[PDB]
Design a protein around this ligand. Structure first.
Ligand SMILES: Nc1ncnc2c1ncn2[C@@H]1O[C@H](COP(=O)(O)OP(=O)(O)O)[C@@H](O)[C@H]1O
Ligand code: ALF
Ligand SMILES: [Mg+2]
Ligand SMILES: [Zn+2]
Lengths: 169, 650
């Protein structure tokens, strides 16, 4: 019930990464996509969900290479790397074939899978899940500024796409 | 000691162990150096008591020389054999005639051996018994390896004992074949050039090779250019203006050079400018107006060339660098006042567009992206970046150190001597074993640097023949490595693809050659050697005036020039002591430079220097035009070898 039906935003898209017309699919293009030059542009292969979040649940699949999914504020630096700055907290499947959760400077590492995020700002709790279901690392983080899901995709493996999966109650 | 010999090393060693002159062809990283170690050890230990033999090992580039010397020294210390090396580094070197005799293993750079052989201090090659040629694919038209082999073969075919020859390679090279037949011909000619009967490639223990050696993966990155470039447009407008200015004075110069449809940022334009120069400063008139026209055209063409260089650097390097170069030229250095006004007019617009980051060079943008995403994926990795020119090495060093986004990178420069020195190269190399993470290298990083950890190779518009492709790709000794060719031209990508094929076709041709029956191979090799030796043997068998290239002032005459130490040129006489003027505080200060006497002509002729006791000025032929004392003809000499005269000592 608490789950929302999110969608990507087309203002923070990376020139290397492409989005489908339905805006339910992201993927890595073979060639760069020329786009507007702006201070918003990441200049790096991650994107943000369109919906702002100021009791919401949304889940993505990791089927089809190297990915990071988490939460980030708007006040984050555009050129900064996802998951290592103050405003961001994420889980990434690193190149050592391991899954980890990244905090301000730290990295707690622990078999990948289809993941889900459930947040409650009133209780200020963040929970990550694996559907098989299963549980991932849970934290107690509440942000003053409203947040967005932040997704980083591997930028050099063409044919690697990410879809947020829309389950129903 | 801890190194355990693997099977394929013994397989490769076998034919050399038997005692035939052989070539070894193995993929990069398999450890051919250890194979050389084993062959040398077995060959040296074979001799009976009271008799001993020598071993010689070459290398082209200095860092490779240093690392091979270190490897040999560490391995052969325990047996007690004495090793040593010679290079350009050793100063006041003990005469080699016996440093060859004193030691067992000697490491060199082939130019030293060629020098000694030509001078004759070393009598003959028979003093040695085993010659090892690393990176043996370079034995070709005039490379020093081939001259050593020329001495070897000229000795053998005519009438003492001769040493065994071993060569190592990772790619024998395909030359310019268009079909398997020509590749086979090229490989046969190569084998003939160094007198080898056997080519050794690992086949029995192949499967062992696949999990021992990881093949690096290849990728391409095409980057488009910007449709609208403010700096390009404004500099092109300056080009059009300066071209109109130059056109107006001269009666004609469209017709002087056959070149047509000259673009602005192309090397063809640079060749056109050079041709116009070399055709105009040689043009004669029946007199001061002649000098004035020469000066005007000289200045116009010089600024044209400098701006064209700025354009090409701008399209290659970052925005700021081109303006830096142009401003330095203008500040360091009538009509020139006019051109200075023209440039200072636009200076501020140029700076404004330079400091607008939206118009950044896209190649640098994509390179930042590649480094960022890789270092995000793997926090720790060692990467190498390949460029064409040292100026770009400095530019990339500064640009990498000045980007807040790339705080990860810790840079390390590497280039050939002359300029980094030998111990500096050794320290930079050893550091990578440490706090450095990226290495910016010129062409010297080919033919084996052997960094135990490298997972990323980047080519910045760097392409060539198949040998360079293979040797560049092979650097990624670490498993999971990758190579990325970054370019803004499709033809480069096409050349890379066709080179990959050429590698495949060569690799098939060598396997075809391996099937041939023995003693027919050797027969055709002997035939080729005989024919080539015959071909080479029969192949071979005043007081003029010099004047300033910019103001046509009578500089001197060749009857007053005396060469010192056969290698410096100077002139004595008070007449020359008036024709020039030094500068009070010379730009290096590190010694006073020479300049044209007339304030109209500020042209640098030469430089002061002191022989053992005497301070004298020396000039460069690059400063004058030569004119006959009898006729009015002129030519231009770019290099003293072409000039012919009565060379007289001090
Ligand atoms: N017995 C061994 N076990 C493991 N590594 C070895 C062994 N012998 C040599 N090597 C490795 O081989 C490398 C030398 O390879 P090299 O012959 O220079 O490559 P290439 O064939 O491209 O010239 C060294 O870095 C060394 O670590
Ligand atoms: F001989 Al190599 F890398 F090809 F050392
Ligand atoms: Mg080698
Ligand atoms: Zn002059």
């Amino acid at each position: 019930q608490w789950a929302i039906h999110p969608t990507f935003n087309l203002k923070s898209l990376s020139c290397s990464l492409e989005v489908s017309k339905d805006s339910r699919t992201v993927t890595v293009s073979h060639r760069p996509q020329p786009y507007r030059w702006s201070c918003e542009r990441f200049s790096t292969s991650q994107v943000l969900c369109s919906q702002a979040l100021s009791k919401h649940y949304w889940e993505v699949d990791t089927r089809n290479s190297h990915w990071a999914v988490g939460v980030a504020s708007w006040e984050m630096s555009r050129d900064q790397v996802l998951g290592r700055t103050m405003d961001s907290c994420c889980v990434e499947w690193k190149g050592t074939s391991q899954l980890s959760a990244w905090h301000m400077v730290k990295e707690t590492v622990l078999r990948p899978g289809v993941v889900g995020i459930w947040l409650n700002l009133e209780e200020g709790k963040l929970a990550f899940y694996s559907v098989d279901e299963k549980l991932l690392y849970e934290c107690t983080i509440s942000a003053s500024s409203p947040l967005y899901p932040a997704f980083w995709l591997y930028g050099l493996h063409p044919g690697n796409y990410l879809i947020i999966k829309q389950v129903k109650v | 000691s801890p190194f355990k010999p693997r099977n394929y090393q013994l397989e490769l060693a076998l034919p050399a162990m038997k005692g035939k002159n052989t070539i070894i062809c193995a993929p990069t990283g398999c450890g051919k150096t250890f194979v050389s170690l084993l062959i040398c050890e077995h060959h040296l230990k074979k001799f009976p008591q009271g008799q001993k033999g020598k071993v010689v090992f070459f290398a082209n580039q200095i860092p490779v020389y240093e690392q091979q010397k270190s490897v040999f020294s560490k391995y052969f210390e325990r047996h007690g054999y004495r090793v040593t090396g010679i290079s350009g580094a050793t100063a006041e070197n003990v005469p080699v005639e016996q440093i060859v005799e004193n030691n067992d293993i000697i490491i060199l750079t082939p130019q030293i051996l060629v020098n000694n052989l030509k001078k004759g201090t070393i009598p003959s090659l028979s003093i040695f018994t085993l010659m090892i040629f690393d990176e043996c694919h370079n034995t070709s038209k005039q490379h020093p390896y081939n001259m050593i082999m020329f001495n070897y073969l000229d000795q053998k075919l005519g009438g003492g004992p001769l040493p065994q020859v071993i060569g190592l390679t990772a790619s024998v090279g395909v030359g310019d074949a268009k079909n398997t037949d020509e590749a086979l011909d090229y490989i046969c000619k190569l084998c003939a050039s160094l007198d080898a009967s056997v080519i050794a490639t690992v086949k029995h223990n192949l499967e062992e090779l696949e999990q021992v050696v990881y093949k690096p993966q290849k990728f391409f990155r095409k980057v488009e250019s910007r449709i609208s470039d403010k700096f390009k447009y404004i500099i092109a407008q300056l080009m059009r203006d300066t071209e109109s200015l130059a056109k107006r004075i001269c009666k004609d110069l469209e017709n002087l050079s056959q070149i047509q449809n000259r673009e602005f940022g192309t090397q063809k334009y640079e060749q056109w400018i050079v041709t116009v120069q070399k055709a105009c400063m040689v043009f004669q008139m029946p007199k001061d107006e002649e000098s004035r026209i020469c000066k005007a055209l000289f200045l116009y063409t010089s600024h044209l060339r400098k701006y064209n260089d700025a354009l090409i650097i701008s399209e290659h390097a970052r925005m700021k660098d081109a303006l830096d170069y142009l401003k330095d030229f203008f500040s360091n250095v009538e009509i020139e006042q006019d051109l200075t006004q023209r440039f200072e007019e636009k200076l501020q617009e140029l700076e404004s567009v330079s400091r607008d980051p939206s118009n950044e060079n896209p190649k640098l943008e994509d390179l930042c992206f590649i480094l960022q995403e890789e270092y995000h994926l793997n926090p720790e990795t060692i990467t190498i970046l390949f460029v064409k020119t040292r100026a770009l090495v400095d530019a990339l060093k500064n640009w990498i150190e000045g980007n807040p986004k790339l705080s990860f990178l810790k840079p390390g420069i590497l280039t050939g001597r002359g300029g980094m020195t030998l111990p500096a190269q050794k320290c930079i190399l050893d550091a990578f074993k440490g706090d450095h993470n990226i290495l910016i290298a010129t062409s010297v990083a080919d033919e084996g640097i052997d960094i135990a950890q490298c997972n990323l190779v980047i080519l910045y518009e760097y392409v060539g023949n198949v040998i360079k492709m293979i040797q560049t790709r092979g650097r990624g000794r670490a498993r999971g490595s990758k190579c990325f060719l970054l370019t803004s031209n499709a033809g480069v990508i096409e050349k890379e693809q066709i080179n990959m094929y050429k590698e495949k076709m060569m690799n098939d041709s060598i396997l075809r050659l391996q099937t041939w029956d023995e003693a027919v191979f050797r027969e055709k090799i002997l035939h080729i050697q005989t024919h080539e030796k015959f071909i080479r043997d029969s192949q071979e068998k005043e007081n003029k005036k010099l004047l300033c290239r910019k103001c046509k002032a009578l500089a001197c005459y060749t009857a007053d020039v005396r060469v010192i130490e056969e290698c410096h040129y100077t002139v004595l006489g008070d007449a020359f002591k008036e024709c020039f003027v030094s500068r009070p505080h010379p730009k290096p200060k590190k010694r006073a430079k020479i300049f044209c006497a007339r304030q109209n002509c500020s042209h640098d002729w030469g430089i002061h220097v002191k022989y053992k006791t005497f301070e004298i000025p020396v000039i460069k032929i690059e400063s004058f035009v030569v004119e006959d004392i009898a006729t009015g003809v002129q030519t231009l000499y770019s290099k003293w070898k072409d000039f012919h005269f009565e060379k007289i000592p001090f």
